[PDB]
């Protein structure tokens, strides 16, 4: 090419190549293409636009150009793009179902939505990637209406009765480490033991802490309450 990239036939098979499938038409079978060779390759985006003597491959599906989340977003090809990117930030920052082994994890925080649903509207990759395992939201009856006067610009209204029926009810887990080895210290002692000895403590602490010094699992705890003794 006149003043183009320096010619050559550089094959690559080594590690870290990024590779993506396209359908090779002359043998009607899948072929793996990388970004280097792609530059000079005519890949029709769909079979009806295959131009004669030009496109040697065609995309299997134009979804092959989107990331996972962009396919999870319905009709992303109908909205202004930055709204799709903010969709990646919202759905990615969305409180949903993080897992189901949450009674066996111990993160500093987890957010778990109890009322989960499967979108009526979805890409088929929603099933193909199984995101239905961990539904993150709910299908709501929405009226697109300014009516109440509190739905302007960026503010939206919920039915009170809907929340009263449990709509979007969510839970937040905070995990704590109670250590008794702050100073671990030389090591002439390490005796701190959960419990009591002097009796003189306020016996109302039993209202929260069991006679082993640990709170009754299930206990309501409020700011100020003893978490252990």
């Amino acid at each position: 090419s006149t003043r183009g990239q320096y010619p050559g036939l550089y094959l690559f098979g080594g590690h870290s190549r990024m590779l993506r499938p396209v359908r090779y038409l002359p043998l009607d079978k899948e072929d793996i293409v990388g970004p280097f060779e792609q530059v000079y390759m005519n890949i029709a985006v769909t079979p009806q636009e295959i131009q004669n003597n030009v496109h040697t491959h065609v995309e299997f599906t134009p979804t092959n150009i989107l990331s996972i989340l962009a396919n999870l977003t319905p009709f992303s090809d109908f909205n202004q793009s930055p709204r799709n990117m903010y969709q990646c930030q919202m759905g990615k920052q969305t409180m949903g179902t993080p897992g189901v082994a949450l009674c066996h994890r111990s993160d500093n925080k987890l957010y778990r939505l109890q009322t989960g649903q499967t979108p009526i509207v979805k890409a088929n990759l929603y099933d193909d990637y199984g995101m239905d395992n961990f539904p993150n939201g709910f299908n709501a009856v929405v009226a697109v209406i300014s009516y109440t006067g509190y739905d302007m610009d960026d503010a939206m209204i919920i039915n009170k009765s809907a929340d009263e029926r449990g709509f979007g009810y969510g839970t937040m887990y905070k995990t704590e480490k109670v250590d008794l080895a702050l100073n671990r210290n030389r090591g002439d002692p390490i005796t701190q033991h959960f419990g009591f000895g002097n009796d003189e403590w306020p016996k109302e602490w039993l209202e929260k802490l069991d006679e082993d010094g640990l709170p009754y699992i299930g206990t309501y705890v409020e700011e100020g309450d003893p978490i252990c003794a």
Binding site: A101, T118, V141, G166, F167
Partner: protein, 69 residues
């Protein structure tokens, strides 16, 4: 998590119709429309409540630490 008690939007109790609906898709091999219609879910708020449910508790319960496994 678990089949909601009521349809958020309407208010009709729906929590009774989960087991019967799932039975109607298995046992009666019916289709979603006809089964929900036999359940009396004649409003789409009622329709969506049960139709979209994902009874994730079945996945949760295999994690029960209070029984040996």
């Amino acid at each position: 998590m678990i089949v909601p008690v009521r349809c958020f939007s309407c208010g009709k109790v729906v929590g009774d119709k989960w087991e019967s609906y799932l039975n109607l898709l298995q046992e009666d091999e019916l289709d979603e429309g006809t089964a929900l219609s036999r359940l009396g879910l004649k409003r789409y708020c009622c329709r969506r409540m049960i139709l979209t449910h994902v009874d994730l508790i079945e996945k949760f319960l295999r994690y029960n630490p209070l029984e040996k496994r």
